[PDB]
Write a protein that binds this ligand. Structure first.
Ligand SMILES: *[C@@H]1O[C@H](CO)[C@@H](O)[C@H](O)[C@H]1NC(C)=O
Ligand SMILES: *[C@@H]1O[C@H](CO)[C@@H](O)[C@H](O)[C@H]1NC(C)=O
Ligand SMILES: *[C@@H]1O[C@H](CO)[C@@H](O)[C@H](O)[C@H]1NC(C)=O
Ligand SMILES: *[C@@H]1O[C@H](CO)[C@@H](O)[C@H](O)[C@H]1NC(C)=O
Ligand SMILES: *[C@@H]1O[C@H](CO)[C@@H](O)[C@H](O)[C@H]1NC(C)=O
Ligand SMILES: *[C@@H]1O[C@H](CO)[C@@H](O)[C@H](O)[C@H]1NC(C)=O
Lengths: 375, 419, 50, 50
């Protein structure tokens, strides 16, 4: 009953602090008798050597779960696709920490990928809650021609079908486009005056600059902006009146790991209490078979509940991602982010700070006017 | 300039190498001859695969890799995704583990596979329904990745269909092994044709539950997609017959036949590149390293592989990479639990059948029945005014039952199609 | 798109509606010239209105 | 036609027998003890509708 859980961490300091954390958690109840032997692989901007290190440090060991962290440099994307691709052979459940991309939401792309961070498409729930608590009926959607944007649009439509409403117009962007005047004018020539933005940081900054240049930052125009579209150059070239979103304690890698390692340690013994299991192959080449406990891991993990985590209960949805994540509605006041709304699960909690609006409005506007311009 | 083809232990290595050598030498000789490197290897392990890909890439800059397999693991295509993303080389999919396609094509990937997507089989299923004149739908699905968009697409297609099919609410299986809510979910199924957008393992249990509920009667019909019926030689005892399915198995094609089409597509792409550009493409300095920045100054091959025509066979591809004219032959489980080809779809994206559908006997249980009462009618008196049908993407006029009649072609030939 | 001049019973009704319902309109003309039915275009399996 | 329950606690043929019931009024010629189980099975099959 010797398990050797591997990990993929960023730097040596992380490799030491997280090893100390898992060593401490070994004796924090959970499993019984002996515990797991932990190991880590440093993050590398190269692929071949990183894959070889992963094979020589995890596959040779008795790995039942994989800890994958965010890239050390946030400027690059460096999606953790290869680790999930390798784990797909044996249905190895990897544990993403802050990978917020919507590519990993569906398990069709990655056979066995689990993360404690909600996908980008989960912002649709926050937007729907805000609309239902602020009495919004007509909404237009502006999403780029990306897989994450399409997933967000589909989620928004499916969640909006409950009220039997319908979006007015849907506008598409491009990964690198600069001239958005046509679509901006198309959005302007509409009854609704509320726009949802979900795209890359550079595209969001460019479209926001175009909107500011074309008088779209005035009174009566409420903007809904995602989490990743408020950082970078947005906080520098964006005036007040923007309702951003941020995850509470979502960026704390140490806090996420301190719960994920306990969850996987308890799940290992939960599976051990079940029938016999299948060990990973020793050599990276020499066994092309597939695990029989792969679906068992998903079955014992979807229904698992852990209230001992830092962020409270850690529940997994049908896609295996974080459920009821703690969101925080942001608001920009004099180029300073002010916390207004608190969203733990299916509930928004406004704060005593007044919700300002573009154009210096202290009251909630609406786009219910027809403008008497019926062609 | 160089083509690499990977095979397995299914056949002999020497004959495969000889056939791959003879491939480009059949017709349409390239201005720059391309060689073939066929290695008999069954090691589908990701590390072995990536090492072999690196060795081939270092092999005088191979500009084309053909990936074959003999197992049923889909992770080979998953590793091929990363391989194509980090190598930027066009790769063609052949029969094997990579036959099934379920992941969206990455923008940096150059994949053009022979498999058909779910949306590409929905039209075939709709044409089959048109041919069978079954206007009632019952979609029994399960919570799986990517199925919500498939359901939305099929709902939009049936809404945009001019026939006006009945579309009941889709009954999805929330949680497996409930044993309590399963009966409540199944109580809402009251139809004759049932669609199973599920997996093999859960579909076996779903059909077992239907048999326990007696949903495999004479009037009941089932349609099976390619993924569920992928393993033709794995027929569980709980599967009732009469499963009309669409697939592209090797019953009408071979690995050699598919690699011939692949090398033809490669030749067409090379000809297009030579027509447009005049510089031979080159790979990265390293085989799998990223010491330098990953950039591709040369234009991608996606625009050059759109109008792919080979000997009159339009092997074109869409923007995603899926085929436009796939195989998608029609198969159905026989009385003795065998699958036979009873239709094709290559003819201008149109579905034609063998005009044979007598499979009505109960398979899950043993209960004879007599429902289809054949009626003989002659058209000589003003009591039957049967005429032709209007070619408007619909069966015929409303509130009228369909029939059939033999049509004679020649005074000597007695063959008559069942129009 | 030259400026024409149209009048009739329907236009009089529209004027009455505009006067009694706070409307300011600019009337256009049909480019196709038909009421609008189902036409057949590439991918004919899609119901597009004209 | 009348559908009778051959043997109690079959758990296999009960669903086959109940599958043939498609109506709004159902006659139950049974006893209390087995009728409780029959109605529980009907509830599991959702036969207690409006
Ligand atoms: C954990 O496993 C690795 C790989 O097998 C090994 O090198 C290491 O020594 C093990 N840890 C301990 C404490 O022995
Ligand atoms: C953007 O496109 C519009 C066409 O709608 C054109 O009038 C405008 O000049 C373009 N702007 C730039 C900077 O290309
Ligand atoms: C925005 O509108 C105001 C008045 O409506 C005008 O003075 C100003 O010039 C406009 N902005 C731009 C960039 O033209
Ligand atoms: C993460 O959480 C721990 C525990 O509350 C805290 O000590 C630490 O400062 C947090 N990290 C950051 C970056 O706030
Ligand atoms: C989540 O927020 C709601 C606010 O409506 C509150 O009632 C609930 O107790 C909160 N739950 C947790 C676990 O904090
Ligand atoms: C609307 O119609 C009323 C007529 O009762 C008129 O007094 C008013 O000025 C109109 N308002 C506008 C904006 O046309």
């Amino acid at each position: 009953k010797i398990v050797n859980i591997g990990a993929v961490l960023s730097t040596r300091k992380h490799e030491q602090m997280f090893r100390e954390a898992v060593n401490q958690a070994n004796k924090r109840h959970g499993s019984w008798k002996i515990q797991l032997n932990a190991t880590s692989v440093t993050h590398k901007p190269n692929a071949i050597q990183m894959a070889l290190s992963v094979c020589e440090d995890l596959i040779s060991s008795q790995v039942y779960a994989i800890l994958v962290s965010h890239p050390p440099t946030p400027n690059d994307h460096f999606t953790p696709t290869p680790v999930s691709y390798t784990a797909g052979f044996y249905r190895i459940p990897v544990l993403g920490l802050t990978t917020r991309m919507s590519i990993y939401s569906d398990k069709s792309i990655h056979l066995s990928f689990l993360r404690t961070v909600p996908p980008y498409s989960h912002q649709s729930s926050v937007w729907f809650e805000m609309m239902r608590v602020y009495s919004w009926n007509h909404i237009i959607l502006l999403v780029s021609d990306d897989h994450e944007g399409r997933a967000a649009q589909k989620r928004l439509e499916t969640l909006l079908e409950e009220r039997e409403s319908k979006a007015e117009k849907v506008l598409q962007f491009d990964p690198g486009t600069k001239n958005v005047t046509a679509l901006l004018m198309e959005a302007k020539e509409l009854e609704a005056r509320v726009i949802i933005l979900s795209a890359s940081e550079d595209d969001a900054a460019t479209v926001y600059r175009a909107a500011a240049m074309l008088n779209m930052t005035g009174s009566g125009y409420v903007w809904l902006v995602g989490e990743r579209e408020i950082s970078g150059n947005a906080l520098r070239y964006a005036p007040d009146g923007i309702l951003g979103l941020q995850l509470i304690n979502g960026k704390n890698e140490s806090a996420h790991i301190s719960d994920a390692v306990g969850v996987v340690a308890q799940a290992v013994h939960e599976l051990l209490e079940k029938e016999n299991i299948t060990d990973p192959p020793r050599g990276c080449v020499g066994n092309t078979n597939i695990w029989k406990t792969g679906p068992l891991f998903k079955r014992v993990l979807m229904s698992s509940k852990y209230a001992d985590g830092v962020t409270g209960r850690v529940e997994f949805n049908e896609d295996g991602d974080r459920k009821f994540a703690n969101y925080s509605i942001m608001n920009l006041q004099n180029r300073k982010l002010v916390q207004v709304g608190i969203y733990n699960g299916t509930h928004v909690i406004p704060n005593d700070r007044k919700i300002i609006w573009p154009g210096g409005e202290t009251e909630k506007p609406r786009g219910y006017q027809m403008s008497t311009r019926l062609k | 300039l160089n083509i690499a083809v990977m095979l397995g232990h299914s056949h002999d290595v020497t004959e495969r190498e000889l056939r791959t050598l003879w491939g480009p030498e059949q017709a349409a000789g390239l201005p720059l001859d391309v060689n073939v490197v066929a290695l008999l290897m069954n090691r589908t392990d990701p590390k072995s695969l990536i090492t072999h890909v690196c060795d081939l890439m270092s092999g005088a800059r191979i500009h084309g890799l053909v990936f074959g397999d003999d197992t049923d693991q889909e992770a080979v295509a998953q590793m091929l995704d990363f391989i194509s993303s980090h190598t930027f080389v066009p790769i063609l999919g052949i029969h094997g583990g990579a036959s099934m396609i379920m992941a969206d094509k990455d923008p940096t990937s150059t994949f053009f596979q022979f498999g058909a997507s779910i949306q590409q089989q929905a039209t075939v299923m709709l044409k089959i329904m048109q041919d069978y004149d079954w206007h009632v739908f019952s979609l029994v699905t399960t919570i799986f990745p990517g199925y919500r968009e498939f359901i939305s697409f099929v709902k939009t297609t049936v809404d945009n269909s001019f026939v006006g099919w009945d579309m009941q609410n889709v009954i999805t299986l929330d949680t497996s092994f409930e044993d309590a809510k399963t009966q409540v979910q199944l109580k809402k199924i009251h139809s004759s044709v049932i669609l199973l957008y599920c997996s093999k393992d859960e579909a076996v249990l779903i059909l077992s539950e239907a048999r326990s509920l007696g949903l495999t009667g004479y009037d009941f019909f089932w349609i099976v997609p390619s993924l569920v019926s992928g393993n033709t030689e794995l027929i569980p005892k709980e599967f009732p017959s009469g499963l009309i399915s669409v697939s592209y198995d090797d019953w009408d094609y071979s690995l050699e036949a598919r690699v011939r089409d692949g090398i033809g597509i490669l030749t067409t792409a090379a000809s297009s590149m030579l027509e447009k550009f005049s510089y031979i493409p080159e790979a990265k300095a390293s085989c799998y390293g990223q010491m330098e920045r990953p950039e591709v100054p040369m234009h991608t091959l996606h625009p050059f592989m759109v109008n792919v025509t080979w000997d009159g066979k339009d092997l074109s591809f869409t923007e995603e990479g899926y085929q436009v004219h796939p195989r998608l032959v029609v198969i159905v489980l026989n009385k003795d639990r065998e699958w036979e080809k009873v239709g094709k779809w290559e003819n201008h994206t149109l579905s034609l059948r063998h005009a044979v559908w007598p499979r009505y006997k109960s398979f899950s249980d043993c209960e004879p029945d007599d429902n289809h009462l054949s009626i003989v009618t002659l058209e000589e008196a003003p009591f039957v005014i049967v005429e032709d049908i209007d070619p408007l993407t619909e069966t015929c006029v409303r509130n009228t039952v369909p029939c059939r009649k033999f049509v004679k072609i020649n005074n000597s030939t007695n063959e008559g199609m069942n129009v | 798109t030259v400026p024409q001049c149209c009048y009739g019973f329907c236009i009089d009704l529209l004027i009455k509606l505009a006067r009694t319902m706070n409307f300011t309109y600019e009337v256009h003309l049909v480019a196709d010239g038909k009421f609008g039915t189902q036409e057949r275009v590439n991918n004919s399996n899609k119901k597009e209105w004209n």
